[PDB]
Structures are given as structure tokens and as C-alpha cells.
């Protein structure tokens, strides 16, 4: 009573019902480094300008 | 000009220049700490973008 698969069937992506748990960390990665802080705030003008030796703007 | 005008104008000049000098010393200290530790917005030399990584199931499973 076995039926041979048609052209296209054995390459289908099928879904599998399992009882084992999903691997939560399969790469065994350690804790990632904390990122650098983002920039926040409103952008104020430069305090007394460029501060390049005598340039007052 | 009056001695009042010259005096208080000198005080404003000295305030502005002392504040610029304190900001220059702080700018040097910030640059030194950010080059030493590398946790500021400066000296952030680039690494590889992790958006380039393909996360699909590959041809072989052990990867
Ligand atoms: C209602 C809306 C409208 C309102 C309008 C209100 C205003 C009405 C008037 C409108 C016109 C405004 C014009 C500019 C304002 C005056 C700026 C000024 O004098 O700054 C003083 C500035 C600093 O002095 P200050 O007492 O602290 O500030 C007074 C003001 O509060 C200065 O204010 P500040 O604190 O904001 O200044 C900012 C900062 C203040 O400066 C600094 O923080 C210090 C750094 C300055 C530069 C240092 C460079 C050093 C190495 C170069 C040496 C150059 C040698 C001289 C030139 C050699 C020959 C080319 O300036 C700069 O960063 C600009 C760089 C210098 C350019 C100055 C403007 C020139 C415009 C006309 C150019 C014509 C040619 C002139 C000769 C070219 C060189 C100047 O002094 C100098 O730069 C010394 C040179 C004199 C500047 C030029 C004088 C302007 C008028 C020139 C007319 C005659 C032309 C003759 C023929 C051509 C030449 C053969």
C-alpha cells in the first residue's frame, strides 16, 4: 500500500511535533558585553565657541 | 573709559577666559580617558556589523 512520492514532495519543508525542549543557547554563547551609552540631550551651542587659542567664535 | 568700565569689563574677560581654560583642561582629560578606556562616543574604531551574519539553517547542521 505504499505510494511513491511525486516530483516535488520529498523536498517540501515539513513541520515536526517534538517533545524535547527547544535549545535556549545552542551556540553556548556567554554574556554579551554591555554597549557604550547612546547620545542623548538637546544640542547646545559650544561654550565660548571653538576654544582654539584665541578664536572667540 | 571709566575705571568702572575697564574694571568690570576686565572681570568679564577674566571669567570668559578662565572658563575656556577649564574647559580645555577638561577636554584633554576627557580625550585621555576615552582613548585609554574606549567607552565614550570618541575613538570608536569600527567592528564588523552583525547584520551581515546569515542566520538561516545552512547545508550542514554543526555550525
Ligand atoms: C540687524 C542685522 C544686522 C546687524 C549688523 C551688525 C553689524 C554691523 C556691521 C557689519 C559689518 C561687520 C564686519 C565684521 C565685524 C568686525 C570683526 C572684527 O573686527 O573682529 C575683531 C577681531 C577680534 O577683535 P575683538 O576686539 O576681540 O572683537 C571686536 C568685535 O567684537 C568682533 O566681534 P566678534 O567677537 O564676534 O569677532 C569674531 C571673531 C573675533 O576674532 C577672533 O576671535 C580672533 C581671531 C581673528 C583672526 C586672527 C588671524 C591671525 C592671522 C592672520 C592675520 C591677518 C592680518 C590682518 C590682515 C592683513 C591683510 C589682509 O572674528 C573671526 O573669527 C573672524 C576672523 C577675522 C575677520 C574679521 C572680519 C573681517 C571682515 C572684513 C574683511 C576685510 C579685510 C580685513 C583684513 C583681513 C583679516 C581680518 O580682530 C581681528 O580680527 C583683527 C583684524 C581686524 C578685523 C577686520 C575689521 C573689520 C572691518 C574691516 C574694514 C576695513 C577693510 C580695509 C580694506 C581691506 C584690508 C586691506
Q: Which residues line ligand 1 (CB under 6 A)?
A: A 54-57
Ligand 1, atom 82: closest residue by C-alpha: A55
- Please state the atom number of ligand 1 nearest to the C-alpha of residue A56: 43
Q: How far does residue B23's CA lie from ligand 1's centre (Å)?
A: 25
Solved by what technique?
cryo-EM
Please give the C-alpha separations between residue B30 and each of A17, B20, B33, B37, B40, in angstroms, as whole numbers: 57, 15, 5, 10, 9
Return d(Cα A42, Cα B7) in angstroms, integer: 36
Place of cell 571709566: B2
> For residue B40, which of B53, B29, B56, B54 has the smallest C-alpha distance?
B29
Say how many C-beta atoms besides its own lie within 10 A of residue B33's C-beta. Answer: 13
Is residue B45 within 8 Å of residue A42, measured between CB atoms? no
Contacts for A37 with CB less than 8 Å, ≥ 6 apart: B39
Is residue A36 within 8 Å of residue B44, measured between CB atoms? yes
Residue B40 burial (CB < 10 Å; 0-12/13-18/19+)?
middle
Return d(Cα A29, Cα B56) in angstroms, integer: 18
Q: Is B57 on the interface with A (CB under 8 A)?
A: no
Return d(Cα A47, Cα A57) in angstroms, integer: 9
Resolution value in angstroms: 2.8
Amino acid at each position: 500500500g505504499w505510494v511513491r512520492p511525486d516530483l516535488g514532495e520529498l523536498s517540501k519543508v515539513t513541520k515536526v511535533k517534538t517533545d524535547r525542549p527547544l535549545p535556549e543557547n545552542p551556540y553556548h554563547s556567554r554574556a554579551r558585553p554591555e554597549p557604550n551609552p547612546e547620545v542623548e540631550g538637546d544640542l547646545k551651542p559650544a561654550r565660548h565657541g571653538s576654544r582654539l587659542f584665541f578664536w572667540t567664535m | 573709559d571709566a575705571p568702572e568700565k575697564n574694571y568690570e569689563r576686565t572681570m568679564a574677560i577674566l571669567q570668559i577666559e578662565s572658563e575656556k581654560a577649564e574647559l580645555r583642561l577638561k577636554e584633554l582629560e576627557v580625550r585621555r580617558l576615552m582613548r585609554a578606556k574606549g567607552d565614550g562616543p570618541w575613538f570608536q574604531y569600527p567592528t564588523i556589523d552583525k547584520a551581515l551574519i546569515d542566520h538561516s539553517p545552512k547545508a550542514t547542521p554543526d555550525n
